[PDB]
Amino acid sequence: IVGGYTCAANSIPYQVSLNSGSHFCGGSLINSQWVVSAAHCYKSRIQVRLGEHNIDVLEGNEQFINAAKIITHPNFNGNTLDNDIMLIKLSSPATLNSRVATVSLPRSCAAAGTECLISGWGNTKSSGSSYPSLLQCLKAPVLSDSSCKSSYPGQITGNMICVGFLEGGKDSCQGDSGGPVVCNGQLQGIVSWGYGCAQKNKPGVYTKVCNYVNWIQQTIAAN
Template sequence: MKCLLLLAFIGVAVAYPRFAEDDDDKIVGGYTCAEHSVPYQVSLNSGYHFCGGSLISSQWVLSAAHCYKSRIQVQLGKHNLELTESSQQFINSAKVIRHSGYSAYTLDNDIMLIKLATPAQLNKAVQTVPLPTSCVATGTTCLISGWGNTLSSGCEY
């Protein structure tokens, strides 16, 4: 039994991911974007950043239903979450609407709308996401943005 436990601990130690000291990728396989090159990306806050979303109009944000909180403060115009930026705007939510068919178990219908209490001031650093007018062709390269975890658990941003 002691041998089995020792082997288990060694297995965990070997399997634990190691990070390069200069690893600043925030999304697995991603890269740091140029400042304000994704002006529709927003940070959802409740005293701390907990999820991202996309500004789809001056008063609406699209996010994932698994990010639901009854009260959310939306940060717009941010690039670096750790710095105060002159371009940032803080707007409270007026309404948070999860898809009625959302399942926390299966993550089906994992979509949510957030109505902002006041419209966002659109400028160079705060813009709505350019929505397509038709379906994109199969194989089209698309951009996914956010301040995601580098691990599936924990809080390495």
């Protein structure tokens, strides 16, 4: 997260870190047994870390739970990043409390201008790279589909939304991938891609979660 601020500890209690030795992607806890992330974060083995603030230090509220199922959208395309969505089923249920809590799927797609909260442990620099120990947060608005397409001609499918700022300076970045865009208590976006990070007229591009809620319920029901 570039241009954000350090979240208060455990104030984003649905945020998870995906770890395969080290942190590599984010995700969001949507029920006690299932995490939503990005298919481009897929690995064949993943440990989900819940209840994290400092990902480098044990603080007493962490839950480390292995992914028993790692399910990507069958028509994910690694080049266009269309259908950039993944579901993880935990090998045991997360224990829910004030520091580890679920976020709701969206009831409807978010309107342009809706204020969201994006979070993660990704790169905090618009040029070069620095990775934080403490979870970062960024308030940012959904941008219109027309603005998104103007910023990324030929690259925006119906399964993608832009969120952030055309001016530059505030965006998600590598390492935030798979993490949450939450607006009015609903997971509307998954950190997916962008041109660089926090560059002028290159806002972040996010998986449009409202298009996938039926796929999510069918996948849960089959697993």
